[PDB]
Amino acid sequence: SDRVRSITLGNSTITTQECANVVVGYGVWPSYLQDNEATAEDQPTQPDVATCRFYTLDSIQWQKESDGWWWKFPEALKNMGLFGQNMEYHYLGRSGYTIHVQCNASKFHQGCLLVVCVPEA
Amino acid sequence: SATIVMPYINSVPMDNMFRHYNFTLMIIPFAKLEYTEQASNYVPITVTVAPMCAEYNGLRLASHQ
Amino acid sequence: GAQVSTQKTTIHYTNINYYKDAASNSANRQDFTSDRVRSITLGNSTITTQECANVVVGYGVWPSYLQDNEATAEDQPTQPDVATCRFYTLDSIQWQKESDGWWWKFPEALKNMGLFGQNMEYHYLGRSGYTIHVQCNASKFHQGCLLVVCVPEAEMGCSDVEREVVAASLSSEDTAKSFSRTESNGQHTVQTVVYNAGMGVGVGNLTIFPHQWINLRTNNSATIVMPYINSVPMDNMFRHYNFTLMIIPFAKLEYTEQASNYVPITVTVAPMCAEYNGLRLASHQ
Amino acid sequence: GAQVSTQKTTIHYTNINYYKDAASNSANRQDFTSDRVRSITLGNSTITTQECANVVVGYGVWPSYLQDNEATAEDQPTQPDVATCRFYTLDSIQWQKESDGWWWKFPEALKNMGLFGQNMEYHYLGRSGYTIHVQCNASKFHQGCLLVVCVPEAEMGCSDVEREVVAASLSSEDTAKSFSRTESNGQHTVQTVVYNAGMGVGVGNLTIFPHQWINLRTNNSATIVMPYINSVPMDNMFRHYNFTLMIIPFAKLEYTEQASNYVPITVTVAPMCAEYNGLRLASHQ
Amino acid sequence: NYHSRTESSIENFLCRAACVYIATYKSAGGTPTERYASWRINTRQMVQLRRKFELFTYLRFDMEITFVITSTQDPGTQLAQDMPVLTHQIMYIPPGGPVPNSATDFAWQSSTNPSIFWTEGCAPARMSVPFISIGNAYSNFYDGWSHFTQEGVYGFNSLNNMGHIYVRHVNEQSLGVSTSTLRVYFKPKHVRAWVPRPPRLSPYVKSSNVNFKPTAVTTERKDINDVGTLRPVGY
Amino acid sequence: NYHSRTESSIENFLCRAACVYIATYKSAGGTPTERYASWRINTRQMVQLRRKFELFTYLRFDMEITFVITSTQDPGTQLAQDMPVLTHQIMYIPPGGPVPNSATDFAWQSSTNPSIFWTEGCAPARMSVPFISIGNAYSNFYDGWSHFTQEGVYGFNSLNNMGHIYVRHVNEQSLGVSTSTLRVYFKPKHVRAWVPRPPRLSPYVKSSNVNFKPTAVTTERKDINDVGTLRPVGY
Amino acid sequence: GLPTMLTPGSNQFLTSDDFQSPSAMPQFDVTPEMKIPGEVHNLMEIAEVDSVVPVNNTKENINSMEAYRIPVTGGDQLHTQVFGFQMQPGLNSVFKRTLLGEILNYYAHWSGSVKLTFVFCGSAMATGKFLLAYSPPGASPPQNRKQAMLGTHVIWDVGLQSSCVLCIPWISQTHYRLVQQDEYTSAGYVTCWYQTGLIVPPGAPPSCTILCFASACNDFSVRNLRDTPFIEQTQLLQ
Amino acid sequence: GLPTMLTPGSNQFLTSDDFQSPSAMPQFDVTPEMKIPGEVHNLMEIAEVDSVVPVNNTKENINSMEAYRIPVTGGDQLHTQVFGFQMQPGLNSVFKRTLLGEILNYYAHWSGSVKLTFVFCGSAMATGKFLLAYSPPGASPPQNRKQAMLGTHVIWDVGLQSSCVLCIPWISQTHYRLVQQDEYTSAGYVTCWYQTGLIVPPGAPPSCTILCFASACNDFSVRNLRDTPFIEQTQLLQ
Ligand SMILES: CCCCCCCCCCCCC/C=C/[C@H](O)[C@H](N)CO
Ligand SMILES: CCCCCCCCCCCCC/C=C/[C@H](O)[C@H](N)CO
């Protein structure tokens, strides 16, 4: 009925909002590591479809006296898809992330939330 | 909902993912959720991450575990 | 319309197509006339073959990618160029005097080695060309011969009639199945006689398939660059074997009393331009 | 004569017509490639729908007149543009929890309203397009859904086999016939089960006919601008029903304890460009 | 995206000859209704063609009618011993024409009617008929009565006025008795189809209206989230 | 060197019609499986064509199917005395279609199926079929299982999904009983052949896999240096 | 005269032919052409119109209307699977009497991308997120959300938008898959899992009903024609 | 209409014909073309690939693998004949199940030059010379080396090169010789004799094994087509 943007990455989409802002990291978009700043010896292939899907983790349950929750994402996707089947073999690794956290709302369910991706916590 | 497009932040350009955590999500409710008597009480929260432009180097026939 | 041509003996023939289908015309039936050695470095593991040795390039063609001109997939995730291209070495089979022969089944013989068994365990489709290199260390007093051949679609008959075959007996995990110089008596195993090569054909007639000889006089090793041969462009590697190696010694090895008697044979395959499609969060086993 | 063309795979076909009739040729089988709301003011009665709401324009076409290019009548008396174009409002059906569905038959459902039942009672022929607008007043705590559909030529089967139907049971005068969620046991009535929609088809497959949804979350009303669909250009309106509305709730309405329980549904049709022919001094009833 | 539709067209879905009627007529004296075989032209007799037509409300096509007339020998005594070939006559009757009461009637001359004589052992007889109706389209559904006072028949059985095909033998057969069966086939071409409509879920029970018994929507599976079988049917 | 090859081409080696099946079906009441005759479309039944196909791994061709349908008279009593010509009906069934249980069934209309009616005493019936498969080539050898967990059938019997040809009589035959035999012939044209492979030395034993008994390589001669005969067989 | 030779194929009655024939009504003019609206050209235009699919096709429910309404109860579940079905458009009970299936059942082979649009019929104040994932044939059906996340998926916010649509992609070994799909040429499972849990306020009813609409995307094709194994008859009905 | 006359040849079913026929699947598009490698054009390209010939085809040996290995014992012989066979590519036991023979057995007439390449599988240090001579039909088979020397021959030094090849020449009264060769249209005997005697040093095994590869030269042709008298059946195998 209404217009909503749909990020299609890999083969799994989402539907966020038309009016919602999307925070692009520390200003920069996630990009590859070019030959200008590489220190490796040989560079085997990186997949563009096999590890780009919107993997969904377990659903935490919000109650009244719920304190908070955290994750550690390079060691939180080790079982999902091939992202835990490429890094289990190769020595090095580099990936940017596109976290999308959602909770189904209603007009009589007041409350707030803060998400934050602290680096090197 | 909320969507953060985090970039790869590290000093070294490449490091192993099993002995290093690149960052950490923290979902902390600053204001507690207060419903009413005739309202739903099982509000869930999911996280739906997706690695963008994942690169790998140094193939070793290891199969870690 | 109103065509004129020639026939195989002026004399001509005027045939018209009276139908609106391309498969309703007649058959065509007419023609319109210290030392230098090369070192293959693929992935991060080299070999050393010979300067003088020929390398058989498959059925004429070099192994290449599957372009967008002949793709039927929906979305195409990445293919690695370093992670799965190394010269993986399999187990070393041991050549004796009365050794019959050995075979392999390569889409289900690399499932444990490297990431080639860690990409095809997840993705649905698969496509890879192979660069087999089989070697045995020679000496001047160790006469004997060898034949290698990469037969494609080597359907093998069962030992007992009106039976099927079992996957435990058709292929092995790390070992090469022997080729009994006699006849197997099994109820579910493979008919593994050596003078019929499993498929029932004459074992002298295995020379159509790309083949090379490892004659101990004038050759130390053999390298076959087999291309991906299949009707469908993409098929799963766990329920389909693309081809089959067959190492059958035509002349037995005859050493002398004061000579070595533990001559080994290794195979050192390497998948070239391995492509994958259909990532499903499966982790097969 | 002497035509050449292409076939679906140079290759061609030369077929000639040997007969003097257009229906004797072969089949062709070849292709040659406070807020703003809109207000419909029709006649002298307006509506207010929404700014954001879509309006389904029939089978693509807007309702228009019958020009002289496709008329088969003898003499053509006048058609009114103000007298029969008003948004006539029918009776208000009442939506409850276990309400099955409702239907109408519109050429014999406007016979009492205005002059539309005072022009077609005299003239022999008739032609009119319709501009149905069905509305129900919404609220944010009144979940439920609705489907409207203007099925054309909705031949309805009788309740008992080897019987016909009766005009008293097929249509009603001012009321909408219910759609029993079970099966009618009548000897002459209509087979009015709700999971077969009367015609015997699957009730999920009523979405070909111009349809709109009155989902209480994101829609307050629905407007279908149906065009005049008939084989013959002109036919009498008393022995022919042009189409049939069907309001079937797919999701039942579920309110709460302290909420309103008398949610109504009205239909507010309006004939567009109504033409008449064959004035006979009859005064039918 | 280079997988365009050719065999999904309105022609190739409807340019296939379906069997419409099965007649049976003998060739002996006595019971004169057994000598000939009449048929009012419906498409509603056989189901295999009826469901293809009842996807669209209106239609307009030219047709190709064909007949595979085969015959047997009836049991009993006084059989032929030897028998020449026996020819059949297929006569169309327009709406409002005189019909024959029996065989060897006065009205079997067919001066205006398009009769066709067919010999056994040949190709099946074939003819083309154009779009023949008073209306502009062959309406498959007529939600309306016959009379203006809302009585008479109801349904599609008011604009199906296409007359009858009356078939007979044209040999006397002095010795024996032998039946024959007529199988009419309709292959509509130049087809145009207006106002599509859903397929009939319920089975057909009549050739006069849209009577039906209230059937289920689909078949039943196990649960809401039943995925069928996870492994094959063995073990 | 002016002895080039024309009859060694891939066309003329494979553009010859070989017999593929031998059916037999009666025309009497009782035992309804004897009235019709079904056949799943293989090429692996007859050997004379099978060895020509199993020189190449993959193939791609258009075909010309022909049938020499001949019939006899069954012994016993109540024979015909006299008998008109009897016509046969050959119906193709696609993979996933409804098959007839017996003769005079409801499903013998064949609205979508490409049936063909043939009369005796004429030329044999003929049709052309294109390259019809889901794959890109008719694979003669499929070294692989059906299921991804390596169970089910093994061999070429997983991509041979070509449906069946079901043949029947279309005369009632009130008096007598008479069988008929169907002989299907395949003549592939526009043939392309990929990846050649050796001929089968062992004899064929099955039409499901490549089962075989271990046979000798060639026949035996006398010695290593046997030149056969030095003079003729006389003296 | 002309010395022709009768080839094989003479005096036959192949049904799917295209031959000329003499006319039985010669010089018969027709009624002139009229523009009835809705002149369909190809049959696949009926398979581009959405038709509700009976997702809750349980044994008791199929007879009733409540076979089209899929339950989405509100509470803390986070494991319950709202629905799952093999995406076989021809044989599967879910899609066979739907419009896409009925045209498809006529044609033997199917190639294209199906689109399922799941509307939410619920109170305006309700808000929730659901993950609908097409898992390709691979190995075993998804049984927990973590298994479903790997396969292609869309997160739908019920509150932000009703009617989220998933265009199930065409990933297949062969160009065409038979409508009567076998283990070979089969299609992957499709499943939907709770992401946050429906949050319905006190004033609205907790339960809600979600319905499924299935129509082929533009790139859909059929390859053969066959009898429909859905309708039958016994005698000449009179 | 056109007054044709049906010539003799009407209503027949000649098998090796080329006639048109109406299509049973009209307007049926195909799967697009793919480039599978190894697209053979003519059948004789299989008869240009070498296939080992069972030269030691003795009764006990044929069942065993040891029918392809021809013995070349080392010692002073100078009279022993390593092998001899009539060069009949179709009937001869030696060449009939070889690839050249199997394609040839399908075709009735054979014309061309056969090539036999004899590889030596032996210790690197071994050295010897062998005279392989094609004696044309003439009179009687060669029985001593002096008899063989007159006929066309090649002296092969085993030590200098393994794999010496003899292209047996085409010398014949007729352009084509029937595969089932009779005394007329027959072919000459081929034989191999020791020239110097194999000299194998103390460290290597005295015995060695020589194998024979047979493939037609470029100028080979076939003339007719016939049933293969090698494969048969009894009933419709099921
Ligand atoms: C060759 C002799 C027989 C000629 C028969 C006359 C032509 C056949 C009548 C054409 C049938 C028209 C198609 C269907 C007409 C009606 O609309 C349908 N029955 C609707 O019920
Ligand atoms: C005219 C009515 C009958 C029409 C029959 C349909 C066409 C016949 C099927 C074509 C057969 C294709 C050639 C062989 C297919 C498989 O690859 C082989 N059987 C391999 O076993």
mmCIF file of C-alpha atoms in Angstrom, chain A:
data_model
loop_
_atom_site.group_PDB
_atom_site.id
_atom_site.type_symbol
_atom_site.label_atom_id
_atom_site.label_comp_id
_atom_site.label_asym_id
_atom_site.label_seq_id
_atom_site.Cartn_x
_atom_site.Cartn_y
_atom_site.Cartn_z
ATOM 1 C CA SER A 1 0.000 0.000 0.000
ATOM 2 C CA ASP A 2 2.911 2.298 0.867
ATOM 3 C CA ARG A 3 6.449 2.651 -0.474
ATOM 4 C CA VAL A 4 9.320 1.061 1.467
ATOM 5 C CA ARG A 5 12.930 0.654 0.372
ATOM 6 C CA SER A 6 14.219 -2.914 0.114
ATOM 7 C CA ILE A 7 17.928 -3.667 0.424
ATOM 8 C CA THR A 8 18.569 -6.740 -1.739
ATOM 9 C CA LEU A 9 21.986 -8.136 -0.823
ATOM 10 C CA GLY A 10 22.855 -11.691 -1.745
ATOM 11 C CA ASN A 11 19.511 -13.447 -2.112
ATOM 12 C CA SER A 12 17.668 -12.218 1.001
ATOM 13 C CA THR A 13 15.949 -8.841 1.206
ATOM 14 C CA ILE A 14 14.638 -6.653 4.022
ATOM 15 C CA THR A 15 12.017 -3.907 4.278
ATOM 16 C CA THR A 16 12.974 -1.036 6.547
ATOM 17 C CA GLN A 17 10.997 2.220 5.954
ATOM 18 C CA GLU A 18 10.877 5.068 3.476
ATOM 19 C CA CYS A 19 11.508 7.729 6.137
ATOM 20 C CA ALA A 20 14.231 5.966 8.142
ATOM 21 C CA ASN A 21 17.842 7.090 8.077
ATOM 22 C CA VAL A 22 20.606 4.535 7.558
ATOM 23 C CA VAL A 23 23.877 5.218 9.374
ATOM 24 C CA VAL A 24 26.792 4.585 6.998
ATOM 25 C CA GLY A 25 29.500 3.504 9.471
ATOM 26 C CA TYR A 26 32.284 5.969 10.202
ATOM 27 C CA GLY A 27 31.275 7.875 7.072
ATOM 28 C CA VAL A 28 32.731 5.318 4.654
ATOM 29 C CA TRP A 29 30.950 2.610 2.659
ATOM 30 C CA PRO A 30 32.374 -0.930 2.944
ATOM 31 C CA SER A 31 34.688 -1.598 0.005
ATOM 32 C CA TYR A 32 37.374 -4.032 -1.088
ATOM 33 C CA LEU A 33 41.067 -4.012 -0.209
ATOM 34 C CA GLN A 34 42.758 -2.785 -3.380
ATOM 35 C CA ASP A 35 46.239 -3.599 -4.654
ATOM 36 C CA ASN A 36 47.434 -0.191 -3.402
ATOM 37 C CA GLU A 37 47.396 -1.326 0.245
ATOM 38 C CA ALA A 38 47.867 -5.104 0.152
ATOM 39 C CA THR A 39 50.693 -6.921 1.941
ATOM 40 C CA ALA A 40 49.713 -10.504 1.062
ATOM 41 C CA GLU A 41 51.579 -12.906 -1.227
ATOM 42 C CA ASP A 42 48.784 -14.531 -3.261
ATOM 43 C CA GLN A 43 45.097 -13.616 -3.212
ATOM 44 C CA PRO A 44 42.506 -16.355 -3.842
ATOM 45 C CA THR A 45 38.907 -15.598 -4.708
ATOM 46 C CA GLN A 46 36.246 -13.777 -2.710
ATOM 47 C CA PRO A 47 32.558 -14.672 -3.218
ATOM 48 C CA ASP A 48 29.877 -12.090 -3.954
ATOM 49 C CA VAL A 49 26.737 -14.262 -3.676
ATOM 50 C CA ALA A 50 27.790 -17.141 -1.410
ATOM 51 C CA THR A 51 28.594 -14.942 1.608
ATOM 52 C CA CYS A 52 26.469 -11.824 1.349
ATOM 53 C CA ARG A 53 23.060 -13.037 2.541
ATOM 54 C CA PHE A 54 21.124 -11.437 5.378
ATOM 55 C CA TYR A 55 21.792 -14.094 8.003
ATOM 56 C CA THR A 56 19.320 -13.990 10.899
ATOM 57 C CA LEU A 57 20.579 -14.848 14.379
ATOM 58 C CA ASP A 58 18.577 -16.000 17.403
ATOM 59 C CA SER A 59 15.688 -13.900 18.680
ATOM 60 C CA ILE A 60 16.307 -12.370 22.105
ATOM 61 C CA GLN A 61 13.186 -11.658 24.146
ATOM 62 C CA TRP A 62 12.484 -8.207 25.583
ATOM 63 C CA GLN A 63 10.778 -8.057 28.997
ATOM 64 C CA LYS A 64 10.232 -5.284 31.537
ATOM 65 C CA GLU A 65 13.410 -5.730 33.600
ATOM 66 C CA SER A 66 15.743 -6.715 30.770
ATOM 67 C CA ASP A 67 19.226 -5.330 31.218
ATOM 68 C CA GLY A 68 20.923 -5.575 27.839
ATOM 69 C CA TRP A 69 22.548 -7.879 25.317
ATOM 70 C CA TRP A 70 25.794 -8.004 23.348
ATOM 71 C CA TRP A 71 27.415 -9.990 20.535
ATOM 72 C CA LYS A 72 30.897 -10.485 19.035
ATOM 73 C CA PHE A 73 30.400 -10.840 15.297
ATOM 74 C CA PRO A 74 33.596 -12.364 13.771
ATOM 75 C CA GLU A 75 32.936 -15.201 16.244
ATOM 76 C CA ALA A 76 29.143 -15.097 15.988
ATOM 77 C CA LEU A 77 28.669 -16.191 12.348
ATOM 78 C CA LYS A 78 30.856 -19.315 12.488
ATOM 79 C CA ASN A 79 27.904 -21.677 11.938
ATOM 80 C CA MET A 80 25.760 -19.688 9.483
ATOM 81 C CA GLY A 81 26.169 -20.424 5.792
ATOM 82 C CA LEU A 82 29.582 -20.430 4.151
ATOM 83 C CA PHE A 83 30.892 -17.470 6.163
ATOM 84 C CA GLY A 84 31.854 -20.027 8.786
ATOM 85 C CA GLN A 85 33.053 -22.319 5.992
ATOM 86 C CA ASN A 86 35.476 -19.891 4.334
ATOM 87 C CA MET A 87 37.102 -18.431 7.457
ATOM 88 C CA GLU A 88 37.522 -21.939 8.888
ATOM 89 C CA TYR A 89 40.057 -22.652 6.119
ATOM 90 C CA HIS A 90 41.757 -19.400 5.116
ATOM 91 C CA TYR A 91 44.252 -17.740 7.445
ATOM 92 C CA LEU A 92 43.387 -14.067 6.928
ATOM 93 C CA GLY A 93 40.020 -12.344 6.693
ATOM 94 C CA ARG A 94 38.306 -9.021 6.002
ATOM 95 C CA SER A 95 34.615 -8.162 5.837
ATOM 96 C CA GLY A 96 32.330 -5.211 6.366
ATOM 97 C CA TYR A 97 28.981 -5.687 8.065
ATOM 98 C CA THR A 98 25.439 -4.409 7.485
ATOM 99 C CA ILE A 99 23.637 -4.995 10.805
ATOM 100 C CA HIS A 100 19.861 -4.534 10.804
ATOM 101 C CA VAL A 101 18.063 -4.988 14.143
ATOM 102 C CA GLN A 102 14.262 -4.941 14.234
ATOM 103 C CA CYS A 103 11.417 -5.200 16.735
ATOM 104 C CA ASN A 104 7.750 -5.217 15.750
ATOM 105 C CA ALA A 105 6.076 -2.105 17.151
ATOM 106 C CA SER A 106 2.619 -1.003 18.225
ATOM 107 C CA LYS A 107 1.134 2.301 19.315
ATOM 108 C CA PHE A 108 0.598 1.250 22.966
ATOM 109 C CA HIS A 109 4.032 -0.259 23.669
ATOM 110 C CA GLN A 110 6.211 2.635 24.879
ATOM 111 C CA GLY A 111 9.910 2.059 25.434
ATOM 112 C CA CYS A 112 13.278 2.828 23.901
ATOM 113 C CA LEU A 113 16.433 1.088 22.739
ATOM 114 C CA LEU A 114 20.036 1.916 21.894
ATOM 115 C CA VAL A 115 22.225 -0.114 19.556
ATOM 116 C CA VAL A 116 25.932 0.604 19.154
ATOM 117 C CA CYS A 117 28.755 -1.178 17.310
ATOM 118 C CA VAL A 118 31.699 -0.477 19.593
ATOM 119 C CA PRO A 119 35.012 -1.469 17.951
ATOM 120 C CA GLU A 120 37.656 -3.277 20.026
ATOM 121 C CA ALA A 121 35.471 -3.582 23.123
#
